[PDB]
Amino acid sequence: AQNPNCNIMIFHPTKEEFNDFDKYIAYMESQGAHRAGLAKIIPPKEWKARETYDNISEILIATPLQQVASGRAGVFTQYHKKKKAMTVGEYRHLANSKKYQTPPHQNFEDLERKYWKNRIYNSPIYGADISGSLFDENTKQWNLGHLGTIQDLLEKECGVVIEGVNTPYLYFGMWKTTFAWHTEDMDLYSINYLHLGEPKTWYVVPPEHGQRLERLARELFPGSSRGCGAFLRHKVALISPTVLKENGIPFNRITQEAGEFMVTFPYGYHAGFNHGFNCAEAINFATPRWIDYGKMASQCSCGEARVTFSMDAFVRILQPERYDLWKRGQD
Numbered sequence: 001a002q003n004p005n006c007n008i009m010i011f012h013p014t015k016e017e018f019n020d021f022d023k024y025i026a027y028m029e030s031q032g033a034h035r036a037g038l039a040k041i042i043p044p045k046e047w048k049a050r051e052t053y054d055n056i057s058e059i060l061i062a063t064p065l066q067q068v069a070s071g072r073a074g075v076f077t078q079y080h081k082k083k084k085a086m087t088v089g090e091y092r093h094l095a096n097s098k099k100y101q102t103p104p105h106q107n108f109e110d111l112e113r114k115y116w117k118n119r120i121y122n123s124p125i126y127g128a129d130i131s132g133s134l135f136d137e138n139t140k141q142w143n144l145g146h147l148g149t150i151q152d153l154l155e156k157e158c159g160v161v162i163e164g165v166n167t168p169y170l171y172f173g174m175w176k177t178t179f180a181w182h183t184e185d186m187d188l189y190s191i192n193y194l195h196l197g198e199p200k201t202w203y204v205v206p207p208e209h210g211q212r213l214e215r216l217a218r219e220l221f222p223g224s225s226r227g228c229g230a231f232l233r234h235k236v237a238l239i240s241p242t243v244l245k246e247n248g249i250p251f252n253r254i255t256q257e258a259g260e261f262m263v264t265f266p267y268g269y270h271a272g273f274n275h276g277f278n279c280a281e282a283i284n285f286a287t288p289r290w291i292d293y294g295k296m297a298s299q300c301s302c303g304e305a306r307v308t309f310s311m312d313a314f315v316r317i318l319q320p321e322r323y324d325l326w327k328r329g330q331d
């Protein structure tokens with residue numbers, strides 16, 4: 001069995017290997033990359049996402065989100081308070097202000113220490129979930145707006161034609177902006193490209209051990225667990241590495257820098273934070289190996305998780321027994 005300790009693997013494809021996306025995902029899995037839940041892909045030196053980032057300041061962040069925490073430093077939730085619209089140039093200036101900028105630090109480890117010590121005492125503003133793409137249309141390799149769609153994959157594997165679309169999302173971050181512990185919708189893969197700016201630190205639980213994280217989360221968030229049998233789908237709960245280690249939960253960590261891709265694998269729980277002003281692009285995707293995970297994915301039906309249009313068909317075809325309850329949660 002490849003990668004039996006479930007370590008995060010880092011890949012350096014050549015320009016030739018970078019042509020066929022599906023083939024390279026399958027290669028990484030042949031080497032055991034999925035056992036970690038997360039892999040890093042460093043593009044060949046010949047490749048670029050676009051020519052420059054000099055002209056992005058007029059993109060609008062219609063609904064910036066202020067991430068307000070409650071709890072203790074290592075075990076907290078966050079809620080998202082909506083703020084007035086602002087452009088990417090305005091948000092960049094805000095991120096760089098004395099109130100929000102990255103503090104002086106020695107290295108990524110010192111900054112990680114400062115994040116976990118101090119996150120709860122601040123409320124950073126995240127420009128998340130913005131439909132769009134920063135890949136040039138002429139970038140042919142690993143262009144996250146040109147991937148095979150999940151609807152087409154389901155149709156190829158299972159024969160059923162379904163409605164829905166699959167487009168990328170932009171994320172504009174600042175120091176301390178936070179992504180809570182989650183798996184993807186329907187336990188899909190994700191791919192994330194850090195286009196520019198400061199790093200993103202990731203934490204991940206191997207898919208084979210995801211239920212250990214869920215059991216800890218039910219202990220640590222007992223009111224939320226009574227409210228919903230899949231409350232991590234709400235994407236609000238944070239647990240620090242120190243608390244994970246105290247409770248014996250297997251996990252790994254890695255820092256993504258600008259110019260790098262990360263892939264999350266089906267049922268790989270992940271969480272993390274941004275180091276300073278940055279911009280990422282991410283999208284969900286599927287492979288044949290996903291189908292079995294999609295069929296078994298948990299679902300939130302309490303009303304909180306509320307998701308895209310395209311998840312309807314995935315539930316309806318892969319999980320017909322759960323469909324009626326889940327759809328009630330959507331309405």
Ligand SMILES: O=C(O)CNC(=O)C(=O)O
Nearest residue numbers: 171179190191192280282
């Ligand atoms: O970058 C972020 O805020 C969150 N991204 C992801 O959870 C992802 O790419 O799957």
Ligand SMILES: [Mg+2]
Nearest residue numbers: 056057058059
């Ligand atoms: Mg612009």
Ligand code: NI
Nearest residue numbers: 183184190270
């Ligand atoms: Ni994710």
Ligand SMILES: [Zn+2]
Nearest residue numbers: 228300302304
């Ligand atoms: Zn719920």
